């Protein structure tokens, strides 16, 4: 089990994705090999799991809580953090990560807060969700326009493909605001973009509210909500990976799912050390009165 973080994988040959002949064992090995990358996000944050016991051709279980865990190493958080439910979950090691895969996990989504203080988010996320019939170039322009606004606000943002159909923007914040304050700020950004360019942006959820447009989704900033971890896999055809990218290579992208679990190695080799999110951990910013004035 040297390639699976010491974890025994049952039914190693069952297929997670028949389209590319990706087995459960392959998925487990990917998580062992890149555990450190995924842990850059998962290590100190509560995590929600997307489990697919029958692969992507079957259905998916979105799990936040668990009473009994068969994942050696997985941490069960204090029930007081979410009364009336079994413990929340936290993965802090490769063993726990691979163990989750052994138990059917395909996706890992994290909270916008870390164990240091789960009542003060350390980031907010903006997910640009497009109409399933909108040209990719539209998402490209929408991303640039969103980044320009963030720059004017004086906020450093970190971009990554979603592995699905849109782009994700992570904005770190000092732990000086409550959940509501941060979510409302994110919503204010969405609404601002919607008022400036209503033909491009929407600040209201629901497909019928973004026909031929892009919804600047701020709802993942609700306490308990979560966002796909950078470098993690999506339970979709081709097993796409969510990949951090440089703003300078944004217009060179052709989709939000160009990279997958097998092409990630090529991506890492091409970068050869270059880290799109090199300045993430060192970023120190907070919500200011000036930012609220601009919005």
The torsion region of residue 56 among left (phi > 0), alpha (psi -120 to 50) and beta comes to alpha
Is 212 annotated as contributing to ligand binding? no
Domain annotation for the chain: domains and CATH numbers:
14-295 (3.90.920.10)
Is 109 annotated as contributing to ligand binding? yes
Residue with tokens 């979410």: 82
Tell me what percent of the chain is helix, strand and coil, each rounded to the nearest 5: 30, 20, 50
Helix (DSSP H) and strand (DSSP E) numbers for the chain: 7, 14
Is 94 annotated as contributing to ligand binding? no
Å resolution of this model?
A: 1.5
Is 11 annotated as contributing to ligand binding? no
Is 273 annotated as contributing to ligand binding? no
Q: Strands 22-23 and 47-51: what pairing?
A: unpaired
Is 163 annotated as contributing to ligand binding? yes
Mapped onto helix, strand or coil, the DSSP state of residue 243 is: coil
Is 177 annotated as contributing to ligand binding? no
Beta bridge partners of 124: 171
Is 290 annotated as contributing to ligand binding? no
Which structure tokens are listed for 164? 């699905």
Which structure tokens are listed for 30? 């990917």
Those residues whose C-beta lies under 8 Å from the C-beta of residue 209, and which sit 6 or more positions away, are 202, 215
Is 122 annotated as contributing to ligand binding? no
Nearest CA-CA partner of 25 in 11, 35, 5, 39: 11
Is 235 annotated as contributing to ligand binding? yes
């Amino acid at each position: 089990r040297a390639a699976t973080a010491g974890v025994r994988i049952s039914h190693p040959q069952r297929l997670i994705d028949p389209s590319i002949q990706a087995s459960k064992l392959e998925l487990a090995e990917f998580h062992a090999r890149y555990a450190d990358l995924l842990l850059r996000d998962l290590r100190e944050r509560p995590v929600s799991l997307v489990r697919g016991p029958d692969g992507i051709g079957g259905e998916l279980f979105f799990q936040k809580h668990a009473a009994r865990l068969k994942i050696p190493g997985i941490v069960q958080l204090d029930p007081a953090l979410d009364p009336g439910h079994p413990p929340l979950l936290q993965i802090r090691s490769a063993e726990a990560l691979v163990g989750a895969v052994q138990m059917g996990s395909i996706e890992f989504h994290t909270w916008n807060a870390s164990l240091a203080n789960l009542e003060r988010p350390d980031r907010f996320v903006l997910d640009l969700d497009p109409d399933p019939a909108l040209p990719w170039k539209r998402m490209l322009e929408a991303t640039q326009l969103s980044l320009t606004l963030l720059d004017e606000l004086g906020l450093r943002a970190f971009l990554k493909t979603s592995g699905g159909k849109g782009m994700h923007l992570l904005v770190p914040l000092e732990r000086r605001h409550g959940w509501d304050e941060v979510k409302d700020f994110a919503q204010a950004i969405s609404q601002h973009l919607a008022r400036l360019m209503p033909e491009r942006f929407s600040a209201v959820s629901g497909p019928r509210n973004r026909v031929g447009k892009i919804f600047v989704d701020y709802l993942r900033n609700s306490r308990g909500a979560s966002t796909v971890a950078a470098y993690s896999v999506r339970a979709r055809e081709g097993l796409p990976v969510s990949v951090p990218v440089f703003r300078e290579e944004l217009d060179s992208l052709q989709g939000a799912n160009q990279w997958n679990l097998r092409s990630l190695p090529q991506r890492l080799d091409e970068l050869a050390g270059d880290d799109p999110w090199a300045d993430y951990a060192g970023t120190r910013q907070r919500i200011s009165a000036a930012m609220r004035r601009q919005l």
